């Protein structure tokens with residue numbers, strides 16, 4: 158009397174939940190083993206990306222340091238591969254914070270924002286950011302609960318395949334309530350509104366940029382290589398001779414080694430690009 | 439087959455080395471990859487203490503407040519809970535007080551505790567004095583220990599002694615009313 162949870166009367170996370178909520182809303186019988194969590198991760202990640210786009214388009218975040226700028230206690234140090242840069246766009250921090258890795262089903266670390274964000278949450282409970290965290294966190298959760306359930310069952314732990322499964326479902330409900338709150342907020346009107354320099358950061362003036370240290374600057378350069386085509390922001394950073402000593406120094410510190418986005422390849426490229434730009438400034 | 443089945447839980451601030459600790463205990467491996475745990479995970483390893491064969495069911499939790507609702511639900515059913523801090527992170531040590539609070543709140547009345555400072559291999563950056571820490575632990579009738587997950591230093595011991603303190607409590611509970 159098998160009941161593995163059914164994949165496609167939905168191809169988008171929000172709906173695909175409720176084809177699932179639906180039939181966990183509708184009992185005794187369950188092979189979670191056949192379930193595609195990995196597909197679920199693929200959908201959720203789109204959900205996150207699409208929710209981020211939307212937020213940045215509706216101006217929902219309202220120099221222009223970002224929201225989390227005043228809560229940085231990092232001392233410009235690199236926290237697990239990332240340094241704090243007050244010019245990250247909120248929607249990128251969003252992405253970095255809630256997108257699930259398909260290879261581990263866990264998060265890639267975006268540590269320098271982990272604390273400032275929490276602080277920001279504690280000081281603006283009504284904020285949009287919170288309502289979004291609440292939502293996407295439940296998305297991470299649902300994902301997790303499924304992971305657990307699969308292996309618990311796979312291991313025995315009848316206690317485990319059971320007490321969660323009550324919860325997995327229970328999360329579905331709070332999600333919805335979340336989708337509902339978030340939704341109304343994004344329905345709000347907004348005036349029209351782009352930065353040519355970067356996909357990831359707000360505009361950074363000459364003054365602002367020079368005040369960055371090697372970890373901060375390296376972090377920016379690594380972030381820019383996430384774009385398919387060389388960016389004006391990185392050409393500005395790499396073409397400036399005064400910046401290099403501290404950028405390369407940070408590379409050598411070994412601090413970026415653990416990153417998941419091929420820091421070795423990125424760094425090798427950055428060094429090549431700098432070599433090129435060093436000629437003819 | 440086993441004589442005992444103990445359920446353990448690791449808790450502490452984000453990035454202090456919980457997952458790295460559990461992996462070292464279960465798989466004897468260590469990865470440097472910057473991965474962060476979502477919600478909870480669990481590994482299983484069987485040890486034998488005092489000729490008795492003990493099954494360890496160990497759950498890693500996520501340190502971020504945004505996951506608390508999910509992790510907390512795993513306390514009450516635990517025999518022992520290892521609280522972990524980073525000997526290079528003063529705030530994570532200061533948070534131990536709050537972490538112990540979360541135990542009083544979700545965990546069973548007579549659950550076994552254990553304080554751990556990780557990353558002891560980082561001699562240069564160490565900022566929490568062992569001595570200062572053994573005090574606090576003592577002040578509470580709790581065992582203490584400094585581990586490096588990177589090197590295997592005191593890792594197998596930490597779990598071993600949490601296991602030992604449970605068999606001890608398990609035994610007193612069968613004995614007296």
Ligand SMILES: Nc1nc2c(ncn2[C@@H]2O[C@H](COP(=O)(O)OP(=O)(O)O)[C@@H](O)[C@H]2O)c(=O)[nH]1
Pocket residue numbers: 237415450451452453454455456457458459470471472473474475500501556557558559560585586587588589
């Ligand atoms: N040098 C050193 N670094 C460690 C040790 N344990 C953890 N780390 C670092 O701390 C990071 C976070 O460890 P992790 O287990 O993922 O933290 P948690 O699961 O959130 O508690 C790792 O990626 C390592 O870079 C250790 O024993 N020695």
Ligand code: BEF
Pocket residue numbers: 450451452453454456474475476499500501502
């Ligand atoms: F950063 Be770990 F997941 F607490």
Ligand SMILES: [Mg+2]
Pocket residue numbers: 456457458474475498499500
């Ligand atoms: Mg962990």
